[PDB]
Amino acid sequence: ARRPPLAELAALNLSGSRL
Amino acid sequence: EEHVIIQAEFYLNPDQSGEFMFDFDGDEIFHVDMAKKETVWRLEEFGRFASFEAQGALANIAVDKANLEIMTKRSNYTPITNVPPEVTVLTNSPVELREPNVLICFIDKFTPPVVNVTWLRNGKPVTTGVSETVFLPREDHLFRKFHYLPFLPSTEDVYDCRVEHWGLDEPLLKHWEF
Amino acid sequence: MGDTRPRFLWQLKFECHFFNGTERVRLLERCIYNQEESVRFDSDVGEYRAVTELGRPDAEYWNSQKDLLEQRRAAVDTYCRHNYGVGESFTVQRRVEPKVTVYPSKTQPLQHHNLLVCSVSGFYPGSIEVRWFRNGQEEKAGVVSTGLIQNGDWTFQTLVMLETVPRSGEVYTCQVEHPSVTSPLTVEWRA
Known part of the structure; x- marks a missing residue:
């Protein structure tokens, strides 16, 4: 992958979960 | 000089359909194809300048799905209210007999992001050369979508974009003529 | 489309707003359920706020984790400015x-x-x-x-x-x- 990467922001789990 | 870059995701039940995309001032940079697990640049040339690792977007779709489930329950299973689309048909460029052009079906202001779209020439379905965008986000949290049909303008053919959506009582037919 | 079962929709929107190149940058994160925003992060504030009652548990949970907040506050650099730098030539320019x-x-x-x-x-x-x-x-x-x-x-x-x-x-x-x-x-x- 030679080209500079776009970075995503990660999604957070809501209150009340596990996975 | 203001600009905005938006990372936009959705997940919808019970369709189990998801989207992940980046938007720059209202145009799509890329989306991730869920079935192929692959970055799809809107314009091919963008892939010469930048990369994107699709794995992270897939990981986010999994969180989004779980979160949808939590929220669905937390809301006491409140479902979405359907908002039917506004549809406009137009062309790329000024229309001249027998000069290649493209018909655009512009589908706007709707939710949820499920719509059935058919191009008709003289009442009959056409698949030749059609393509379409993924769902683009709006500031009111409704959706925008484009469908395209390359065509040769003539006086013998009329066209219709046929759109069905849950918010509509009957299919919506937008007509175009030379 | 004969399937008329109720639909439930979740959206997430991470918006990087740029004024005068990257001199002023503002990150807004939004969680939307159906058509309604529930919780928001705004980098001018640097903590989550509930937009509606349904968002309150999420705001509270996330704001309890200062390690997490710190990372979101840094995203104006690690995410917004970074992506602008990557994308500038073929978007902005x-x-x-x-x-x-x-x-x-x-x-x-x-x-x-x-x-x-x-x-x-x-x-x-x-x-x-x-x-x-x-x-x-x-x-x-x-x-x-x-x-x-x-x-x-x-x-x-x-x-x-x-x-x-x-x-x-x-x-x-x-x-x-x-x-x-x-x-x-x-x-x-x-x-």
Whole structure:
């Protein structure tokens, strides 16, 4: 992958979960 | 000089359909194809300048799905209210007999992001050369979508974009003529 | 579509807002359920806030984790400024010149044309100025437009229409200024 990467922001789990 | 870059995701039940995309001032940079697990640049040339690792977007779709489930329950299973689309048909460029052009079906202001779209020439379905965008986000949290049909303008053919959506009582037919 | 079961929708939106390149940058994260925003992060604040009651548990949970907050506060650099730097050349700096054509039209069936249409198509970015002139004098009366049309493919178009009664010998000019060109584009029409 030679080209500079776009970075995503990660999604957070809501209150009340596990996975 | 203001600009905005938006990372936009959705997940919808019970369709189990998801989207992940980046938007720059209202145009799509890329989306991730869920079935192929692959970055799809809107314009091919963008892939010469930048990369994107699709794995992270897939990981986010999994969180989004779980979160949808939590929220669905937390809301006491409140479902979405359907908002039917506004549809406009137009062309790329000024229309001249027998000069290649493209018909655009512009589908706007709707939710949820499920719509059935058919191009008709003289009442009959056409698949030749059609393509379409993924769902683009709006500031009111409704959706925008484009469908395209390359065509040769003539006086013998009329066209219709046929759109069905849950918010509509009957299919919506937008007509175009030379 | 015969399946009319209730739909439940979740959206997430991470918006990087840029003023004067990356000199001022503001990150907004939004969680939307159905059509309603529930919780928000705004980098001007640096903590989550509930937008509606349903968002309150999430705001509380996330704001309890200062390690997490710190990372979101840093994203104005690690995410917004980083992505701008990657994407600038082919987004911010994209320039595609407009194609300009002029054709006559009619407000209704008529023996003579009483509309001059200035079609400006295939351009990027969307910022554009389109003016009508008659014999070198700007016309402001009798002008209507589509406004700016997004094509979906990183081009825009517009049509700018001038209602007029042409007299032979008159020359009408459609003039277009767009960042892609250093002097105006003009197309002339003689009646």
